[PDB]
Design a binder for this molecule. Structure first.
Ligand SMILES: [Ca+2]
Ligand SMILES: [Ca+2]
Ligand SMILES: [Ca+2]
Ligand SMILES: [Ca+2]
Ligand SMILES: [Ca+2]
Lengths: 355, 345, 346, 345, 49, 98, 20
């Protein structure tokens, strides 16, 4: 026997198998639909492994999925004394967005399997999607082609506004094929909207001499706007804020910093949470990524730093003007880190227990 | 089980006089979606996906052999592909597998083997516009050489499809509307601040000086007559700055809207945006723009205003919406603001 | 027949890389399979619409010395849009994917990928959105498991065989997009101090704080190619500029970075810019040189000063070269006028 | 009926340089549970019990035959068994039925016949830790003799299992975190009562004198950087005594917690416990510790305090929890407090 | 094993519950806030007013 | 025609070469590092480590060529040459390789 | 497969023919 310079690790190509799974998960849970008016969609989740805990866990280990059967179970805890009703159904096109609601009901009703029911009754939907092989994740690079990774979306529209507290829940009973073995990263937490349709968030910048004039406020659509106590934030968003809650705004709000001999406009892209008085409280403010600190910061003139041509940092701003804005339950806020990185789901779930 | 097999036939393009098209321009370039044929459309709007079993295009030209010149037609089998928009379109199209040339006096029928894939029947309303999922490609009829005399041309479509996955949708969500003439533009100027003309939309014939946009001109630009409640979402927002005593505010003009002047006899057109105060699109005139203060009270503290200059060409696509920003449907729009009835589009 | 062929061939997918210079876990090869990836394949595939990859064999030529310790992991992730984690953790991710393997740096292998017998489009879609999934069966990777001690040249070739279907010809109306070659520094604009001469000018700011103008051999080191007074580029995000003069005010989005001649044409610099409606072209936003219409139709340049907003750009930002009037520049035209060091893939 | 058959393959240990391990120490000793392989783990977390049809370990060492020394590997088929932790581990492991020895330059693959029992897939969260129910035994790769030059070593696992009984669980309940260095300790002293340093956590290099625990050192001890809300459940509670006027109270320090000092510029670390007043873990500083009286009213009657001395070694396992004592998950922790990415564990 | 869950609460009571069986004597559920979707993943589990 | 590329060096020498035959006298390999991938698209196309010597057979078109270039008239190069043989340096040898 | 210290250039003896 002869000794070589080296012997090479036996070439072995990792090989896996494709499976067929069954299971079920809570797919979505809501509280108190009551504030939502006729045609609002209290439920419309586009179907993806991500949505279900159990499915999403396995689907993570495969590139391509085939949804052979989906079975939805809609319940509503509203007692039999609650008037009104709903329509529930599945639209076999990930791209479709419904009419406005006022008239979405008859549209949803035209999609097969769709059922109309009083709030205090449940519905069950057996959907089939044979011979169609989806990816298990939204494309990271390239355009977001909804149809590749999604077989449709499932809706629950308020037909007649419920008269009392009417929390709603959807549960999916799935059975799928999974192929082409990969391993993916954990899912980044998705866009967040209000849990209530009778309130708005607002930024007013108008009376420039005002103390709280870049802040986010909650206005009951009726009356004058209030400051965002964490308890209010929770009633609007569904969870309690923390000192590092930062969320990406749907459309940027223009802001104009200023001081003698110095002017600069700033695209406000986030709502940060900062500390209010000597690190014991917490308030919410328009915010932007700051190239000085490489973090998203609240846009307070005296605390906004900028480079000058020399490269040095300075805080030359003394006054500032915020354009007014309004946010509603219809708006989508993306949770992100102070680096504008999307936070992964499990981390969000840990920082933001619901209720 | 829900799915069906539909035969039919339908006019795709209505008659046109080819003798008015230049060499190289297309009398037709049309992405195949069900919504072009009437019969086909009206049924496939009640289905999610579609297979095109058969497609035969009938190009008719009802002229005498005295008419010189010819046409070129064919089918590009990719929705994404885009024929070069010169006289160069012709030889490109000709390199595609189906590719007739005939004299204007010779009418044809062109069968098109289409890939037996299932397409969606409508474009995506959500997420990205992956065009290849709902369209199997465009059909073209190009003017090789302009007809020497009036030659009227039409296109019918013999079609056979399969339809699957039952849904329902409306003729349109919204419509897009561009200019009819190309030697003009629409303009906003704010530059001579003191002028009472700033912010209003005007019509400049590209060489001439710009003049106020009056219904009779509006007609020649857009192909229809404007009215009290004409409103439109512009493709690029225009910046606007309002000021007063201890008050400043930036507002993006997101619409061109009509409003009425001197008692309501005439009407004019102004940059406009949604007013959170009134929940309606409004013309952004400083004295008339209302806002909330932090107390929730409504003021109109603005006295000055600065409009940024902008221009719009026949290339710009305006989308009609009602006030409240609800985009108005095609059927409805055509009913409220009627133009000449052509078919394709 | 026509309208359909069967084509075989071997081309070079990726040219030499020295793995000895790559952090552990990083990919020395990370290539999405599209016909244009291979000289002969791409050329002929242009003459058809759809393609089926019957066999793909990746010839990984690892020519590290037989002493030099360490190895590589290579695989084929079966999804165009997926993206490996930038870390050492990418490797065990990739190992999990089917057909993946390790092999020491000296050992070349010919890995056979088994591609789904779906037909793909042959080209990126010119109209509509770039659904990478439509035309790319997946990415082929080669990660550095254990960073090589010494020089470690590695290349890849492809033995391909494909069906080409549905016969067209593409223009090809392709266009490029650039980003920085190096990541040890950024380039930026400044609006303060208002008084300065280099306000709205583009500058390169290293890790070393002080910004500096573009030599433009400095430009060269950032983009990997030499500038030209005909250089113009579209910015990912516009930058607010505020022109102002004697009782006149205008806002302008700086949509482009443009080169322009400096002090009697024997110099070049780079400035913020936008399409000028009067000139019908992209000009640097300079107050005295910026012209505008007025209500009467006349043109004027009443602006005396300007306030540019600060903005930085990184390796991450994607620029796109466009002739004046933001007309996109073909790939071969750009590669000629602005040649970077020849590598493969591009 | 719910149950499945999963094939796969997965990196178990990421590359390491064996030339840095001493003779007798293991580059791997790893109890087989599904949670080590990524693919395997992520699916078996959705099942209660598991059978290991097949297991093949791939030990790769990418080095030249110039590298002297060898390794020993094998599989002990009992979860409870514990290889003697000396250089003696090797000959013990060798008496087990699978037992390779190879030179560092020779890579292997080791198949392991596993008893065809059904294991639980996770350890018991309740009742006793009967380890043999969820683990079929550990896999070991030991350093017979240290490699004479850099030899990088990895371990992949070709696996085939059956999964049964459908459930779902998270990557972790909690994590445990020990020290990275072994020549240091963490200390609490209360002995010189008058000192302002008592109760705070300090770092003593075992020979040297102890010094205040600053972020930069914390880093070298724990492998990551601390912050405002770093908190940890200690394995053995430390006694503490608070006193005032007509007031005495014993309090067990159950956590080490971070808190902020001199305006918030720096932060320090102190013994801490759950405060029933505020429902949060707090640093047990007499003036700042609040309590209920029998009337339910809240006072802070304490002025003095006595901390008992305690020591912690690289052997101690600290568990991170948020204030409120909610133990923070592994995925989450790694995200908030990132260390170098190694794989096994 | 066949379980029958009833609740005497009259039809005027709002709210609901999830019931199910976990096939592992050792498992302890999430905290509740999030236990519901866990319990729901265990087969046979049902959500009801 | 069989070309024998010999490289008398040890497996310690890193790097490799690329060789092949372009079957047209007129063709002209791009004169950069780009030459390599071009040459590789030609039908004969080895790559080997510097320590691995080869022999490369080349199917040549069975045409009759002139044996010398034209001394008169134009230089129609394709008449006397069936194409060039190339051996390119993919990556420089890590040590003396002859 | 195993790596050697070296691989030797395939031994090939030049061979020719005699002509008329
Ligand atoms: Ca994927
Ligand atoms: Ca549709
Ligand atoms: Ca194409
Ligand atoms: Ca368990
Ligand atoms: Ca001669």
């Amino acid at each position: 026997s002869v000794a070589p310079v080296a012997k090479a690790n036996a070439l072995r190509t990792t090989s896996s198998n494709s499976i067929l799974l069954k299971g079920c998960d809570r797919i979505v849970t809501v509280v108190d639909a009551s504030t939502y008016d006729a045609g609002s969609a209290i439920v419309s989740i586009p179907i993806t492994p991500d949505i279900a805990y159990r499915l999403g866990s396995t689907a993570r280990t495969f590139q391509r999925i085939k949804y052979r059967s989906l079975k939805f179970r809609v319940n509503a805890q509203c007692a039999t004394t609650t008037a009104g009703g709903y329509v529930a159904g599945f639209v076999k096109d990930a791209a479709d967005v419904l009419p406005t609601g006022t008239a979405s009901i008859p549209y949803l009703m035209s999609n097969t399997g769709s059922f109309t029911q009083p709030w205090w009754k449940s519905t069950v939907h057996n959907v089939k999607i044979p011979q169609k092989l989806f990816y298990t994740e939204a494309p990271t690079r390239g355009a977001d082609a909804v149809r590749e990774y999604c077989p449709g979306q499932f809706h629950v529209l308020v037909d007649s506004k419920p008269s009392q507290i009417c929390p709603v829940t959807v549960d999916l009973e799935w059975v799928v094929e999974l192929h082409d073995a990969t391993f993916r990263k954990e899912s980044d937490q998705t866009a967040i909207s209000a849990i209530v349709a009778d309130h708005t968030l607002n930024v007013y910048g108008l009376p420039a001499t005002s103390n709280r004039v870049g802040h986010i406020l909650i206005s009951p659509i009726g009356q004058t706007p209030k400051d965002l106590t964490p308890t209010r934030f929770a009633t609007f968003f569904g969870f309690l804020p923390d000192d590092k809650f930062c969320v990406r705004i749907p459309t940027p709000v223009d802001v104009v910093l200023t001081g003698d001999n110095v002017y600069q406009s700033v695209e406000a892209t986030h709502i940060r949470a900062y500390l209010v008085n000597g690190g014991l409280g917490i308030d919410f403010h328009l915010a932007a990524y700051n190239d000085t600190t490489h973090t998203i910061q609240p846009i307070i003139p005296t605390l906004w730093n900028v480079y000058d041509v020399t490269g040095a940092v300075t805080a030359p701003f003394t006054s500032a003007i915020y354009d007014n804005h309004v946010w509603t339950h219809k708006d989508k806020f993306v949770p992100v880190s102070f680096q504008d990185e999307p936070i992964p789901g499990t981390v969000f779930d840990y920082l933001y227990p619901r209720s």
